[PDB]
Amino acid sequence: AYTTFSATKNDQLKEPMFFGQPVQVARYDQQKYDIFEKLIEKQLSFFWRPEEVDVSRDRIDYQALPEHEKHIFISNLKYQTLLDSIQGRSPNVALLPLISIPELETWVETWAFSETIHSRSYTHIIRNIVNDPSVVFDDIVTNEQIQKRAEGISSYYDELIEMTSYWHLLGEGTHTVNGKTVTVSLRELKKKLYLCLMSVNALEAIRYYVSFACSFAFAERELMEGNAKIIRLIARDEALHLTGTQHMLNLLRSGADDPEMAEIAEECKQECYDLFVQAAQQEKDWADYLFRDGSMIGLNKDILCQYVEYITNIRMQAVGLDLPFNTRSNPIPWINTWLV
Amino acid sequence: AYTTFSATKNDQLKEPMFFGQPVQVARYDQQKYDIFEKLIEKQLSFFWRPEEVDVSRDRIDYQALPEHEKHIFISNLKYQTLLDSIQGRSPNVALLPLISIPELETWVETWAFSETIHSRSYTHIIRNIVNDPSVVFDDIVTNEQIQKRAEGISSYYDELIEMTSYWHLLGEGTHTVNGKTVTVSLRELKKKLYLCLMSVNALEAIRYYVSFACSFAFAERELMEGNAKIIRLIARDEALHLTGTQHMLNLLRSGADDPEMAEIAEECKQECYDLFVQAAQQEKDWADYLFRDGSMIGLNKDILCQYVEYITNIRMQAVGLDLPFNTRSNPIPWINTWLV
Numbered sequence: 001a002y003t004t005f006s007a008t009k010n011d012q013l014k015e016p017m018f019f020g021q022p023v024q025v026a027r028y029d030q031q032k033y034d035i036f037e038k039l040i041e042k043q044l045s046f047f048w049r050p051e052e053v054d055v056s057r058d059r060i061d062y063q064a065l066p067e068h069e070k071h072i073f074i075s076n077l078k079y080q081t082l083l084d085s086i087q088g089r090s091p092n093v094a095l096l097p098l099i100s101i102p103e104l105e106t107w108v109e110t111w112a113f114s115e116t117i118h119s120r121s122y123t124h125i126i127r128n129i130v131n132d133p134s135v136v137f138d139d140i141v142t143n144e145q146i147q148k149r150a151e152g153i154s155s156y157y158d159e160l161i162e163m164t165s166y167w168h169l170l171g172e173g174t175h176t177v178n179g180k181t182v183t184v185s186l187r188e189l190k191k192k193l194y195l196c197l198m199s200v201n202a203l204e205a206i207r208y209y210v211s212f213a214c215s216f217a218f219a220e221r222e223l224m225e226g227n228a229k230i231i232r233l234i235a236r237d238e239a240l241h242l243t244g245t246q247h248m249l250n251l252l253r254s255g256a257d258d259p260e261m262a263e264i265a266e267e268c269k270q271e272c273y274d275l276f277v278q279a280a281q282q283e284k285d286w287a288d289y290l291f292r293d294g295s296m297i298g299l300n301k302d303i304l305c306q307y308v309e310y311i312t313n314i315r316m317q318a319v320g321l322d323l324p325f326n327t328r329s330n331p332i333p334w335i336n337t338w339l340v
Numbered sequence: 341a342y343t344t345f346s347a348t349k350n351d352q353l354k355e356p357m358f359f360g361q362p363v364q365v366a367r368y369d370q371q372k373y374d375i376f377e378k379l380i381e382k383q384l385s386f387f388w389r390p391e392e393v394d395v396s397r398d399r400i401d402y403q404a405l406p407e408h409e410k411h412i413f414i415s416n417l418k419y420q421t422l423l424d425s426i427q428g429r430s431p432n433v434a435l436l437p438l439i440s441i442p443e444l445e446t447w448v449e450t451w452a453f454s455e456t457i458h459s460r461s462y463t464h465i466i467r468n469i470v471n472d473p474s475v476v477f478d479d480i481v482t483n484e485q486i487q488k489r490a491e492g493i494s495s496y497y498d499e500l501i502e503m504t505s506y507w508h509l510l511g512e513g514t515h516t517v518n519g520k521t522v523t524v525s526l527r528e529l530k531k532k533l534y535l536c537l538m539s540v541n542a543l544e545a546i547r548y549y550v551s552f553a554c555s556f557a558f559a560e561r562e563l564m565e566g567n568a569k570i571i572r573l574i575a576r577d578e579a580l581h582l583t584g585t586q587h588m589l590n591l592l593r594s595g596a597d598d599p600e601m602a603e604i605a606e607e608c609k610q611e612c613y614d615l616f617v618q619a620a621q622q623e624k625d626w627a628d629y630l631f632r633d634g635s636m637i638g639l640n641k642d643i644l645c646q647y648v649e650y651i652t653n654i655r656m657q658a659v660g661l662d663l664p665f666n667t668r669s670n671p672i673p674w675i676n677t678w679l680v
């Protein structure tokens with residue numbers, strides 16, 4: 001069913017965002033949704049290369065850090081490297097085979113490309129501060145706690161990729177594959193896309209924002225400046241990445257794009273709620289790992305689930321869900337000097 | 341099983357380029373083949389935005405152009421837009437699910453991203469010279485001469501993507517899928533990937549350079565200089581894209597990566613000869629439609645035919661194939677100045 005150039009002259013302004021006919025000519029002169037084209041212009045305007053940032057003094061600062069603080073810093077860096085490794089390849093292998101309008105196709109490619117610049121940033125920081133990089137890169141894959149926090153991210157992507165493969169190969173219906181019946185259903189595939197997309201939104205909206213806080217706390221003490229300059233540039237990109245996912249989900253939820261997608265949003269409302277609360281909870285549980293050997297000036301586990309509670313509430317009402325946490329002002333207003 | 345984060349701690353230096361474990365950590369501190377790292381570095385240095393090139397006088401020059409020269413100018417541009425539309429998405433959908441070392445994975449995504457910039461520069465040129473872009477864009481999909489010149493490209497990719505889905509889902513073996521026997525072999529998928537790559541090698545190395553010669557012919561008569569600026573930037577990216585496919589193909593042939601690919605390259609050497617002959621022929625048959633309303637003084641079918649002939653021999657030799665055409669000197673040496 002998938003093709004890299006569908007031979008049908010079709011009207012790309014009238015196609016749904018997903019599961020319509022595959023894009024053939026990449027046009028940018030008109031668009032169903034201007035927002036995706038604007039996010040492409042803005043992300044190209046923000047292009048930056050990690051190597052321009054001097055992180056040489058960070059090697060000295062990290063070495064002087066009080067051990068539990070070296071742990072807080074590198075543990076958070078290791079989790080940041082894991083997320084951007086998944087965000088470099090996955091928008092592309094998971095969403096590109098389903099997009100039917102060109103501007104969202106080129107936005108998903110600009111977004112995945114700015115994710116690999118973030119992964120390149122983390123090699124630039126690690127190699128500069130730790131002298132045997134292999135010690136931190138190999139601990140990403142097997143570290144129990146990084147896997148508990150990231151639990152569930154690969155799963156959503158992988159199930160969507162697998163389901164997409166059945167759909168494109170076999171189409172809808174009940175089929176037999178070696179004695180087993182396999183039912184392919186487009187409604188199910190749309191719920192899977194929807195939940196996947198709400199999970200990417202929770203990843204960029206919440207999961208990165210908790211790590212920015214740990215990086216900028218060091219920056220407030222004039223430590224790890226350098227790492228902070230890079231995390232600032234990354235934070236500016238993520239504001240756009242998050243704008244993109246919020247627009248995609250509000251458009252699907254509003255019924256403006258595919259009527260059936262709005263039905264699915266409403267039916268899936270409780271599972272979205274619980275899934276956001278589980279993402280927040282994983283961040284909280286993580287704070288226990290991070291601050292087990294003691295806290296640092298400006299940040300501890302108490303100020304952190306507070307901040308995760310605050311940021312989850314902001315992101316959840318943005319995508320029209322109900323707030324799970326009791327309303328707060330921002331517990332760490334100093335962070336806005338580094339973010340927005 | 342395809343996965344976005346393989347749970348196994350693996351030595352990424354010992355994996356093959358293709359069909360080994362899916363990459364989990366995107367690290368850039370070490371590489372099995374540093375040429376892909378050097379190419380990611382080079383491509384990022386060459387970052388350029390189309391929108392910053394002033395193509396306003398091109399509107400006056402194109403207006404002043406005689407009809408048959410407008411035809412030669414727009415047909416060429418319509419085909420280039422079709423190729424980068426396919427090259428923006430197809431590496432990422434077809435190659436990315438099969439790559440096993442991080443440097444090739446990020447080079448394939450930086451390469452695909454530079455193609456969507458080439459697609460975006462063509463919209464910038466088109467929207468500046470024509471009064472309604474849709475008569476250009478809507479003709480591309482339906483132009484039969486464009487689709488005759490293009491035949492082959494979308495199909496190798498879709499076949500490869502299809503075979504990869506059956507392998508990912510079903511695994512190797514002989515299977516019963518809806519009462520039909522479906523055999524999946526990794527050796528046949530390897531051949532498929534290998535010749536997909538030979539084909540990408542032939543579309544980049546040949547089809548693009550023909551289209552460049554037709555663009556710089558106007559520049560040599562001091563017309564279309566804004567378009568000549570963009571095309572010279574695209575050509576500088578294409579030298580990198582071509583080095584990467586010739587290096588992938590030559591490393592697979594050397595038998596230093598996967599031994600079976602070195603066998604595949606030997607066994608399939610005549611199919612690899614034939615698709616280069618077929619591609620060269622597609623390029624010559626285009627000249628009939630390209631100069632159908634009349635030629636230009638230094639640019640006609642015989643000049644385009646011996647240029648295709650000349651560049652096809654240079655390309656085939658660089659990957660160790662036999663030369664099909666009579667050796668000759670460059671029929672249009674003026675192209676050098678524009679290429680470097």
Ligand SMILES: [Fe+3]
Nearest residue numbers: 084087115118
């Ligand atoms: Fe990121």
Ligand SMILES: [Fe+3]
Nearest residue numbers: 087204238241
């Ligand atoms: Fe992001």
Ligand SMILES: [Fe+3]
Nearest residue numbers: 424427455458
């Ligand atoms: Fe290109």
Ligand SMILES: [Fe+3]
Nearest residue numbers: 455544578581
């Ligand atoms: Fe190219």
Ligand SMILES: [Hg+2]
Nearest residue numbers: 157196197200
């Ligand atoms: Hg997703």
Ligand SMILES: [Hg+2]
Nearest residue numbers: 156157196199
């Ligand atoms: Hg997902």
Ligand SMILES: [Hg+2]
Nearest residue numbers: 210213214304
């Ligand atoms: Hg934090």
Ligand SMILES: [Hg+2]
Nearest residue numbers: 076210211214
């Ligand atoms: Hg943190």
Ligand SMILES: [Hg+2]
Nearest residue numbers: 073076214215
């Ligand atoms: Hg940090």
Ligand SMILES: [Hg+2]
Nearest residue numbers: 265268269272
């Ligand atoms: Hg939902």
Ligand SMILES: [Hg+2]
Nearest residue numbers: 265268269272
């Ligand atoms: Hg929802």
Ligand SMILES: [Hg+2]
Nearest residue numbers: 198272275276
């Ligand atoms: Hg959710």
Ligand SMILES: [Hg+2]
Nearest residue numbers: 434536537540
């Ligand atoms: Hg290919």
Ligand SMILES: [Hg+2]
Nearest residue numbers: 496497536539
């Ligand atoms: Hg191909």
Ligand SMILES: [Hg+2]
Nearest residue numbers: 550553554644
């Ligand atoms: Hg030409």
Ligand SMILES: [Hg+2]
Nearest residue numbers: 605608609612
């Ligand atoms: Hg060959």
